[PDB]
Design a protein around this ligand. Sequence first.
Ligand SMILES: CCCCCCCC/C=C\CCCCCCCCCCCCCC(=O)N[C@@H](CO[C@@H]1O[C@H](CO)[C@H](O)[C@H](OS(=O)(=O)O)[C@H]1O)[C@H](O)/C=C/CCCCCCCCCCCCC
Ligand SMILES: CCCCCCCC/C=C\CCCCCCCCCCCCCC(=O)N[C@@H](CO[C@@H]1O[C@H](CO)[C@H](O)[C@H](OS(=O)(=O)O)[C@H]1O)[C@H](O)/C=C/CCCCCCCCCCCCC
Lengths: 206, 206
Amino acid sequence: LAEHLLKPLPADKQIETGPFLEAVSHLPPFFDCLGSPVFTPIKADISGNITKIKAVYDTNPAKFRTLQNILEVEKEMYGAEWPKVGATLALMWLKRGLRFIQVFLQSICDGERDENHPNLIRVNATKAYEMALKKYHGWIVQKIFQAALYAAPYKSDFLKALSKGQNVTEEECLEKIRLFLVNYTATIDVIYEMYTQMNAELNYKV
Amino acid sequence: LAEHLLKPLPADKQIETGPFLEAVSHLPPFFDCLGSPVFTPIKADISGNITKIKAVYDTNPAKFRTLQNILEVEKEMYGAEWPKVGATLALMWLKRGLRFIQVFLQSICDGERDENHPNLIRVNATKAYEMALKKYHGWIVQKIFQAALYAAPYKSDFLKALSKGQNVTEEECLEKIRLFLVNYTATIDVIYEMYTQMNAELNYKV
Ligand SMILES: CCCCCCCC/C=C\CCCCCCCCCCCCCC(=O)N[C@@H](CO[C@@H]1O[C@H](CO)[C@H](O)[C@H](OS(=O)(=O)O)[C@H]1O)[C@H](O)/C=C/CCCCCCCCCCCCC
Ligand SMILES: CCCCCCCC/C=C\CCCCCCCCCCCCCC(=O)N[C@@H](CO[C@@H]1O[C@H](CO)[C@H](O)[C@H](OS(=O)(=O)O)[C@H]1O)[C@H](O)/C=C/CCCCCCCCCCCCC
């Protein structure tokens, strides 16, 4: 993770679209390292959001220099269907997946665990799901999450996979995750705040 | 469905690849008519198989004239990883989805129902799942099927969707499904038999 840190936030809290998309594009490949086909459709959905945002950006990178520019330009371009359109909608969902990853990783780094099963990551994933995604899912998708949770790797195995080849301890691995989390968390928080400020957030369930 | 009937089988039971792929390519769009996002990853998997087979075919349509040609050419081309490779693997999975659809539709047409809930299609889908797919799924994916089953439409709604614009009765709709099922079922049966004859069938679970 720490090979692709996000940029620090500038004083004006603007997030450059190009570097943001470049950074977060390194996250979906991690889903191929979790040891299950159950992660295939997940990877697909997150990558699909990234692809959509990049496709809008590519139409005019200067116009879409920042994530704020995307929202404001699309609000002007689309009128009534906005924010349920375009890159605004894609980023609305992407931020939820990014927040899931943030909460999950932070929970692991913070030593949160089921003391009865300290080498599982279920409690960490459940917390992340509850905080990031659950209320945007109808009861059927929530039931699917609960089933998919059983496909999660052991903690020790997950941390091994995050540091393969590097010959580092788990303690060192977790320090590098904490480093990644600094600008990552700050960036996601700014994106959420922007959605509030722009009245671009929707609450529909799938 | 009856606007894209499969070809009848010739005496030699060979199935031409091009027309087969053209016909079955009309089936994944039906998943957008079931009223739920839960069908998105399903459509993606079936379409992915079709795309893979078409990509192999397109490298040399004469060499890959029939489905039998695909298996025999790939067996020669690949040696030891076969049949877990290429279009052979894609068709191995595609036939299972096609068989699911066949069993499901046939069950509906045959009047099979839960007499306590005659306007659901759960019993029909469960039968199809059991016959076509279940034993290739580990327990986690099976649990996901059980959840996804609740996203199925009402029977009357499903049959309406299959005949939209046509101004036909449900009886007429079902007669047209029965017509589609004739060459469809025969074709799928031949494909299954070919996999047996070629020793191309695998039994691994996902
Ligand atoms: C960095 C290391 C990695 C850290 C993460 C590792 C964590 C591992 C630990 C535990 C595992 C826990 C279980 C997994 C939890 C996954 C959470 C990760 C993030 C989730 C991504 C899905 C987000 C989501 O809910 N999306 C939902 C909404 O999508 C959005 O819909 C919009 C329209 O309303 C747009 O189309 C939008 O796209 S746009 O680009 O056009 O705007 C699009 O993104 C999407 O519906 C859900 C997708 C997941 C698939 C769920 C359905 C599966 C059904 C399967 C049925 C099969 C049954 C039959 C079997 C044969
Ligand atoms: C004609 C009208 C339409 C008729 C049908 C309507 C029926 C509606 C009624 C009731 C609904 C019942 C529930 C739905 C049942 C669906 C059955 C339809 C057919 C299923 C298609 C999936 C087949 C399958 O099991 N595939 C499996 C194996 O795939 C194959 O894997 C191979 C490698 O081992 C290859 O990669 C291969 O591709 S290849 O091209 O490279 O060779 C590929 O096809 C595939 O893994 C399953 C895909 C379905 C997705 C399941 C996982 C969902 C996990 C979601 C987790 C989300 C949790 C977190 C939430 C945020």
